[PDB]
Design a protein around this ligand. Structure first.
Ligand SMILES: Nc1nc2c(ncn2[C@@H]2O[C@H](COP(=O)(O)OP(=O)(O)NP(=O)(O)O)[C@@H](O)[C@H]2O)c(=O)[nH]1
Lengths: 54, 122, 267, 44, 119
RNA sequence: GAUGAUCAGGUUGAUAGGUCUGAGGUGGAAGUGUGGCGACACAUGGAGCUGACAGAUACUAAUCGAUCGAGGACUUAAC
RNA sequence: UGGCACCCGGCUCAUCGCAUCCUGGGGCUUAGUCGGUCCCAAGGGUUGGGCUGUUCGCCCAUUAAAGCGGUACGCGAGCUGGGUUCAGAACGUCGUGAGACAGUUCGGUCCCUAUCCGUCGCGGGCGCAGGAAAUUUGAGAGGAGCUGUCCUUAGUACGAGAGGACCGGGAUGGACGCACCGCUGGUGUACCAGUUGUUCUGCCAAGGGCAUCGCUGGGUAGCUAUGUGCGGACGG
RNA sequence: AAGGAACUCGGCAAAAUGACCCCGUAACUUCGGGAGAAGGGGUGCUCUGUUAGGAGAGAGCCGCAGUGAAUAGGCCCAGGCGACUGUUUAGCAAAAACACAGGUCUCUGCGAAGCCGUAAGGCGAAGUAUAGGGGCUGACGCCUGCGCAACGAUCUGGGCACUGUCUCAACGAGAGACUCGGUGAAAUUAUAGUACCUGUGAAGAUGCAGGUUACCCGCGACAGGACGGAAAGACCCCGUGGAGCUUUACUGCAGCC
RNA sequence: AUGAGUAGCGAAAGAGGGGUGAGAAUCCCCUCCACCGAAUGCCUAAGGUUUCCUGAGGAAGGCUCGUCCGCUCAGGGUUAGU
RNA sequence: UCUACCCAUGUCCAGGGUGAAGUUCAGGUAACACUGAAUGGAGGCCCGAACCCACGCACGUUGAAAAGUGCGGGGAUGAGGU
């Protein structure tokens, strides 16, 4: 099956309503790290709220 | 579970040694039969001379089946072959002898003569 | 029992009725071994107000005396009859003069009416597995029709112009829709004319054996390398050998139609 | 499946070569036409 | 139910046998999170086998441990290390011996990685 | 349960894994003795092994924190 | 150089009409047993095969019954040349030559990622005069609706007799539907055993890899029917 | 599980036989075959045992199962057609169509007859009527039509084995589908803010009239409609449109007399 | 431009530890595992004409990534009386 | 340079079956043709790999491919393939 007619700009913009991303989980810097992710390591030194690992 | 085109084997001394079912009586769209039912069959193997002849259409009662019957108290029965006895419309044995064991269910279906003639009833 | 009656048989009757006017003369083929049972009342009811001749094909396989007696019975009945062997022309020469004598009345009426005499139009009709096409091929010397050793070969009627003298119409065999007398059905099945995959061969063999014991006890005695006449069938069956319990029935019916025995007739 | 072009250097020079063209008159006409157009490559 | 890991049974068993003997030598490894969660069930069973110690148990673990050098100087393979100086470490600790430690995804395909180590 | 969704839980806790007892399944483990020339049989022993099923037990993971979310409009009748 | 009328079968899914096949209620014409005929009624139901081109078609055996029709053959971007229907071949009939008829037969290629409206499921917003957590009424809508035997009534109503109702009770089937794995079975590729060939752990004994899970005998949880439980009863 | 062709135009497809030895083999026949016809029996390991010289016989021991896995023929009847082995529409038709061995008719005395070329020059052939061109049939046994022995991916019919073809479906494995990270096209397309029912209309309405329903936006599925899309079509006329073909239609140049 | 962030990414077993690097599932090294083996082995035709070796590179080409390449720059390489 | 036919020169075909002519001994004879035994190895012979075809079904049909793949099938010392 091929499209019967082209789709206007309005319909396309209305279809793309739910096509977006999500703001991630933001937590505290572990062991003065840099703003690590929830239930994960610090970007600086792999720290768990100050519990460094790896 | 006997149905159309299922070959049984007679267990009486009438002259027919194997039959093939044609229809199962007792319902609009009934397709299966069990121990104690009545079927219409055609004779497929018989001696050239005897009481019954090849190609004749008769009716018979099932007495043995690979899958038996679930009794009330939870007990099950099962045989190793499917066998039938040719009867008349008045429920009497067309032949004179019954060979092999016979299921007890026949007794509750008022098949008293066949049960009486049977050697051993389980 | 025996019920064989396909749809082409039904269409043949309608075609014959729809093309009845053109027919001048009718040939009705009848097997010699069973002259009375081989007749077809169903097609005879349609066929009236038309001259016809009875033909007895396969006359070599039947006893001469009984065939001649049946010929007399047809002759004094009020119908012309003849005995013919299709495979080798025996009586084929004496049918054109008979047709001419029969149709001479209309021929002379037309001649005095002021037209040139024309070709004789004949229609061949009969039960299957009789020489309905071999006779045509012999008469035309051309081998134009298809023939086989089983019933139901041809399927459509066809015109064959034999010279400037004959116009023959062929026709597939026709059987009545329902049999009434089981002995006639048994005889027909024995002689062929039935597909043989619709009937019970064991009953046919039993009928053959009992007829033989009743009529040709000596021919049953000679049989094929065994000499006994017991009460049952299993004595002869297990002559030459798990062996086939009763498939030998086919053997019993195999040779008889090929005339392993001598000539016989069932009448 | 075998495609129609199966390369071979000898047959190419024997059929479409310079000397084959120069052998006959029509080949010389072909060379003259290709010279007139100005094609960088002529013959084969 | 067990995870399938997107492979046939034979290859799944091969991966499990490879990883469970790579962990015993190294004592901490880095894999994907869904592949390290399916691994914690086998290492602890092997550790219990090592803690049993009798000959019948040792021949049971010999069918699930590959032949690798492990320590170099004293020439002891994976099985000897498992039965020698690991069953002695976990002598009074009954239960879990492993720790699963999540971290971020990786550049190539965005799969979430994790580190699994002995306790 | 396609993904969202729904439901059971988040250290005053039995949500999942492991461990210890079971239930079912299979059918007499390795080792060592004895008998036989040998293939093999017997004892130690309803033995050994056991994915998804039960009951106990915080041994390992369910830390942090972040975001959202009211102060009750107008008129007329009975206070 | 006549006469005078007319202008594709099968599969999977269904839905509607009544001009009613069965079941319900009636007059009747018909001892009862029955049967025939004519009204009112569309809720449900309305079969498996053999020969066969299913035809101007035969038969077999059941059932309370094996109704007639409309929807672009109802239905090919859902499936089947299986008829129709092509280029290769035999026979045919007509023809003065280029050809005419199909009269019989054998073989013989179409595809499509769903844009919009439609149907079947599942979510995200906001609204509902304060924010929330539960429990709910019911304007409306959909589902179900079928029948057979046997015992009593008592052979009593009847019928000289032979023969025989019957809808009030009571049991028990057929088909269909909804659930579930305690029983009988099925599968059950990270469960347990037997065994062939070859290769590997230095060798014996113990084991691993590959050969459709290498092949065989069993099989827990889960999912299941051919297994089990229940339903359509009335009543206003 | 139970049944075993009940499906269907049709056993299409799938299932079933298969290896090594030892017994046993029909009708028919062109006497070569048919024929591996059809049907039965046995295979593991140990000892006896340089086993006689690698047995064979004997004794024993295990499992449900002994060519223990992979690879190895399904079989039997009856009719047409063609004798057989072979060749054909590359890319719809592998056949009963073509060829074939044999038979028969006709021309040719050698610069042969036939062909290719305007001619020179060649093939036939360096060959000579038991040898060469051109037609028609198509083995060989019985007649001036009748025989199927052997062969066939041939066309019709039947019977065994065996089974998910089905009564009636149920689980399990793998690659897609689905979610996430990377990269990222196509046919189609007048603008569209694109309901339903009875009517009307070039005659088959999301767009017209009357009425009934319907809060805004998405994701996974189905295929009733947009006379859905692409080969302009999967075909009936017409081209006082072509090409081809046949002459008691004419007129030219070929050859021969 | 729409279809749309949709179909596809062209048969197949990899796992872990080190190293380089601004950046590593894809590059290099090590250890296990796995497939072909009458070839998925080696040697030399037709054909191609710099694709061969070493050092640098991250525009474009590799159906993703790339510190890598049959890609881009520089250099170098093919010895016959048999 | 693809395909049709022809000309001159090379090259390829794992294994296993059946057993013609001829020859020798010899019942038979006076010797045959015919018995058997031994030897012998013919065939547009048989089963079947490499090789060459293309009969059935399924998939693919904006394909891996502008004629392919998978499982079965025919010929396979010759009127052969290259
Ligand atoms: N012995 C013998 N056989 C004959 C004779 N006539 C015919 N046959 C046999 O019959 C067979 C052919 O019969 P046929 O005429 O075709 O029968 P049919 O009536 O035409 N059958 P259908 O009409 O269906 O085609 C052959 O086997 C032929 O040998 C006869 O006179 N004698």
């Amino acid at each position: 099956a091929v499209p019967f007619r082209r789709t206007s700009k309005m319909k396309k913009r209305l279809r793309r309503t739910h096509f977006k991303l999500n703001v991630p989980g933001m937590t505290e810097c572990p062991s003065c790290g840099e703003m690590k992710l929830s239930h994960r390591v610090c970007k600086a030194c792999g720290s768990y709220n100050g519990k460094d690992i790896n | 579970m006997i149905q159309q085109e299922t070959r049984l084997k007679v267990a009486d001394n009438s002259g027919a040694r194997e039959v093939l079912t044609i229809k199962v009586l007792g319902g609009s769209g009934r397709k299966t039969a069990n121990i104690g039912d009545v079927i219409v069959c055609t004779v497929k193997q018989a001696t050239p001379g005897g009481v019954v002849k090849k190609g004749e259409v008769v009716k018979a009662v099932i007495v043995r089946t690979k899958s038996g019957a679930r009794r009330s108290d939870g007990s099950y029965i099962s045989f190793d072959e499917n066998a039938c006895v040719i009867i008349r419309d008045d429920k009497s044995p067309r032949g004179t002898r019954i060979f092999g064991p016979v299921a007890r269910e026949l007794r509750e279906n008022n098949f008293m003569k066949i049960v009486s003639l049977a050697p051993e009833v389980i | 029992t025996i019920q064989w009656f396909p749809g082409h048989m039904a269409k043949a009757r309608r075609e014959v009725t729809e093309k009845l006017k053109l027919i001048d003369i009718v040939y009705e083929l009848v097997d010699a071994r069973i002259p009375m049972s081989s007749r077809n009342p169903m097609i005879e009811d349609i066929l009236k107000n038309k001259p016809r001749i009875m033909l007895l094909n396969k006359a070599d396989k039947a006893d001469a005396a009984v065939t001649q007696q049946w010929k007399e019975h047809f002759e004094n009945q009020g119908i012309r009859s003849l005995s013919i062997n299709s495979v080798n022309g025996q009586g084929l020469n004496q049918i054109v003069p008979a047709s001419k004598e029969i149709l001479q009345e209309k021929f002379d009426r037309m001649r005095a009416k002021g037209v040139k005499p024309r070709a004789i139009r004949a229609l061949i009709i009969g039960i299957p597995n009789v020489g309905k096409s071999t006779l045509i091929n012999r008469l035309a010397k051309k081998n134009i029709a298809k023939t086989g050793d089983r019933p139901g070969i041809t399927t459509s009627q066809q015109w064959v112009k034999v010279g400037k003298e004959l116009e023959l119409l062929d026709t597939p065999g026709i059987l009545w829709p329902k049999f009434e007398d089981e002995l006639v059905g048994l005889r027909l099945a024995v002689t062929g004319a039935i597909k043989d995959s619709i009937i019970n061969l064991q009953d046919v063999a039993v009928f053959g054996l009992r007829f033989l014991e009743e009529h040709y006890p000596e021919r049953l005695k000679e049989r094929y390398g065994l000499d006994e006449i017991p009460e049952d069938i299993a004595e002869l069956f297990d002559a030459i050998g798990l062996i086939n319990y009763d498939k030998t029935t086919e053997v019993i019916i195999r040779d008889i139609r090929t005339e392993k025995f001598g000539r016989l007739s069932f009448e | 499946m075998k495609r129609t072009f199966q390369p071979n250097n000898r047959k190419r020079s024997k059929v479409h070569g310079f000397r084959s063209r120069m052998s006959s008159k029509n080949g010389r006409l072909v060379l003259a036409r290709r010279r007139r157009k100005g094609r960088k490559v002529l013959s084969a | 139910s067990y995870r399938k890991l997107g492979r046939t049974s034979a290859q799944r068993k091969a991966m499990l046998r490879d990883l469970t003997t790579d962990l015993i030598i190294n004592e901490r490894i880095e894999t994907t999170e869904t592949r390290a969660k399916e691994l914690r069930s086998v290492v602890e069973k092997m550790i219990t086998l090592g803690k049993r110690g009798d000959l019948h148990a040792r021949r049971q673990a010999a069918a699930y441990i590959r032949n690798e050098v492990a320590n170099e100087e004293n020439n002891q393979d994976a099985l000897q290390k498992l039965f020698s100086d690991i069953a002695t470490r976990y002598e009074e600790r009954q239960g879990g011996y492993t720790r699963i430690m999540k971290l971020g995804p990786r550049r190539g395909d965005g799969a979430p990685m994790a580190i699994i180590e002995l306790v």
